């Protein structure tokens, strides 16, 4: 399914080219601006352990997930991946633990050495 597809076909958007963050554009956005560091960003997402079944989803709380880009309020993979997204874009990310919660994990939700999969819809972003 979608995680395997990202493993097979996604682009590596890491600087190191260690395949730590793999991306597929699922629905193209408009604009020519991507967000830059400091911006306030609005998304809807669905996220899950890659080997898991149930999502954490913003829709389940019926409100968008807001954060500031590059300010370390979210995992390194979101800081990296959302910086590549256009407004209206839907992207799939697959993320190795080094760009998420690492060998320490983040229990109870995230175990040690967890790979993570998200679908992200970029709704909007505004400059600091
Ligand atoms: C490790 O803790 C969590 C991880 C994740 C979600 C968590 C969470 O408990 C704080 O709560 C979901 C409740 C919403 C409103 N939320 C998200 C955050 N703050 N509040 C942002 C989080 C503090 C950090 O989350 C992230 O950096 C990423 C990207 C943004 C969306 C949430 N993220 C997660 O890692 C989720 C997990 C995704 C895989 C399945 C388990 C949840």
Curated annotation (Swiss-Prot):
The keyword rRNA processing appears for this protein: no
Keyword Chaperone assigned: yes
Residue intervals of the PPIase FKBP-type domain: 30-118
GO biological process terms, semicolon-separated: chaperone-mediated protein folding; protein folding; response to alcohol; response to bacterium; response to cocaine
GO cellular component entries: cytoplasm; cytosol; extracellular exosome; membrane; nucleoplasm
UniProt keyword terms in alphabetical order: Acetylation, Chaperone, Cytoplasm, Isomerase, Nucleus, Phosphoprotein, Repeat, Rotamase, TPR repeat, Ubl conjugation
Modified residues (N6-acetyllysine): 16
Organism for this UniProt entry: Homo sapiens (Human)
Subunit structure: Part of a heteromultimeric cytoplasmic complex with HSP90AA1, HSPA1A/HSPA1B and steroid receptors. Upon ligand binding dissociates from the complex and FKBP4 takes its place. Interacts with functionally mature heterooligomeric progesterone receptor complexes along with HSP90 and TEBP. Interacts with NR3C1. Interacts with Akt/AKT1 and PHLPP1; enhancing dephosphorylation and subsequent activation of Akt/AKT1. Interacts with IFI44L; this interaction modulates the kinase activity of IKBKB and IKBKE. Interacts with IKBKB and IKBKE.
Record GO terms (molecular function): FK506 binding; heat shock protein binding; peptidyl-prolyl cis-trans isomerase activity; protein-macromolecule adaptor activity
Domain of life of the native organism: Eukaryota
Name of this protein: Peptidyl-prolyl cis-trans isomerase FKBP5
Function: Immunophilin protein with PPIase and co-chaperone activities. Component of unligated steroid receptors heterocomplexes through interaction with heat-shock protein 90 (HSP90). Plays a role in the intracellular trafficking of heterooligomeric forms of steroid hormone receptors maintaining the complex into the cytoplasm when unliganded. Acts as a regulator of Akt/AKT1 activity by promoting the interaction between Akt/AKT1 and PHLPP1, thereby enhancing dephosphorylation and subsequent activation of Akt/AKT1.
Subcellular location: Cytoplasm; Nucleus
Residue window of the full protein shown: 16 to 140 of 457
Tissues and organs where the protein is expressed, per its UniProt entry: Widely expressed, enriched in testis compared to other tissues.
UniProt PTM comment: Acetylation impairs ability to promote interaction between Akt/AKT1 and PHLPP1. Deacetylation by SIRT7 promotes interaction between Akt/AKT1 and PHLPP1, leading to suppress Akt/AKT1 activation.
Induction (UniProt): By androgen.
């Amino acid at each position: 399914g979608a995680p395997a597809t990202v493993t097979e076909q996604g682009e590596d958007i890491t600087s190191k080219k260690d395949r730590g963050v793999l991306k597929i554009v699922k629905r193209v956005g408009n604009g020519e601006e991507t967000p830059m560091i400091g911006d306030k960003v609005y998304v809807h997402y669905k996220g899950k352990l890659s080997n898991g079944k149930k999502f954490d989803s913003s829709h389940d709380r019926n409100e968008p997930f807001v954060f500031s880009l590059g300010k370390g309020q979210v995992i390194k993979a979101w800081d990296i991946g959302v910086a590549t997204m256009k407004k209206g874009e839907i992207a799939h990310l697959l993320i190795k633990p080094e760009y998420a919660y690492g060998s320490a994990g983040s229990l109870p939700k995230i175990p040690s050495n967890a790979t993570l999969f998200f679908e992200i819809e970029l709704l909007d972003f505004k400059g600091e």
